[PDB]
C-alpha cells in the first residue's frame, strides 16, 4: 500500500523503570552497617518507605532484616550504633538544628 | 440511615430479657 504509514511495534524510546538503591542486592541481617542506614540515629526507629525511598519489596526485606538482627544480638534497638553515624546518608530526613 | 427499627427491636429484647429474669 504505502511505505510511509506507521508500523506496529513497542516503544523504542521507552525509558527503564526506576530502581531503588538496593535493587539487585542481597540484604543480610548480619550486614548491620547497611541496616543502620535505615533507622533513626536518635531513636532507632525504622524509617518508612517515604523516607528510605525503597520499594515495597526491599522495604520489607530491610524491615525483616532489622527485626531479626535486633533480637539475635547484632543490632541495637533504641538507637543507631554510633559506629555507623558517618556512613552515606541515603534517607530523605533532616534533623539537627 | 436512622436506627429507629433497631430501637424498636432493642426495647423488645431488653423487656424480654428482663421479663425472663423476673420469672
Amino acid at each position: 500500500s504505502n511505505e510511509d504509514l506507521p508500523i506496529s511495534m513497542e516503544n523504542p524510546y521507552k525509558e527503564p523503570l526506576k530502581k531503588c538503591i538496593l535493587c539487585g542486592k542481597h540484604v543480610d541481617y548480619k550486614n548491620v552497617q547497611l541496616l543502620s542506614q535505615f533507622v533513626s540515629p536518635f531513636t532507632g526507629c525504622i524509617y518508612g518507605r517515604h523516607i528510605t525511598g525503597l520499594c515495597g519489596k526491599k522495604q520489607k526485606e530491610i524491615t525483616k532484616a532489622i527485626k531479626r538482627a535486633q533480637i539475635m544480638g547484632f543490632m541495637p534497638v533504641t538507637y543507631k550504633d554510633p559506629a555507623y553515624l558517618k556512613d552515606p546518608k541515603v534517607c530523605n530526613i533532616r534533623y539537627r538544628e | 440511615k436512622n436506627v429507629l427499627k433497631i430501637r424498636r427491636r432493642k426495647m423488645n429484647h431488653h423487656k424480654y430479657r428482663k421479663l425472663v429474669k423476673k420469672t
Binding site: 523503570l17 531503588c20 535493587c23 539487585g24 520499594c55 531479626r68 539475635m72 544480638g73 547484632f74 534497638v77 | -
Partner: protein, 118 residues
C-alpha cells in the same frame, strides 16, 4: 536442608573458645549435620546487655556455622545450645544463600485512585 547458625559465645581466651566451637560442631555432627564452613565475625560489644546462665554479658564472640542437617536436627540442636553455659545466644536460620532473589525490572507506578479506593 541448609542452615546458618549465628553463634554468640562468651568472651573467653583462645583455648576455651576453640573448645566451645569444637564441642558445638560435634553436637551438630552427632545429630546428623554435614558442616560446611565456620566463620569468625570477631569479638565485639553486644548491642545490649544479655543475661545468660546467671551471668551478665557485654562482649561476645560472633561465629557462623554453615551446615546441612535434617529438619528434625534443628529442634534438638536448639535444645543443646540452651544448656551450653559458654553460649550467650544461638539461633539457627535457613541459610540466606539458598533463597534465590527474583529479578526486578523496577518500581512500577501505582495509581493514586487505588490508594484511596483501597
Amino acid at each position: 536442608p541448609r542452615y546458618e547458625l549465628a553463634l554468640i559465645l562468651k568472651a573467653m581466651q583462645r583455648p576455651e573458645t576453640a573448645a566451645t566451637l569444637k564441642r558445638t560442631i560435634e553436637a551438630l555432627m552427632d545429630r546428623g549435620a554435614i558442616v560446611r564452613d565456620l566463620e569468625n565475625l570477631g569479638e565485639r560489644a553486644l548491642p545490649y546487655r544479655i543475661s545468660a546462665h546467671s551471668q551478665q554479658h557485654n562482649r561476645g564472640g560472633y561465629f557462623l556455622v554453615d551446615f546441612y542437617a535434617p529438619t528434625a536436627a534443628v529442634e534438638s540442636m536448639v535444645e543443646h545450645l540452651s544448656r551450653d553455659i559458654d553460649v550467650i545466644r544461638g539461633n539457627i536460620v535457613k541459610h540466606p544463600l539458598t533463597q534465590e532473589l527474583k529479578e526486578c525490572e523496577g518500581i512500577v507506578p501505582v495509581p493514586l485512585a487505588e490508594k484511596l479506593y483501597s
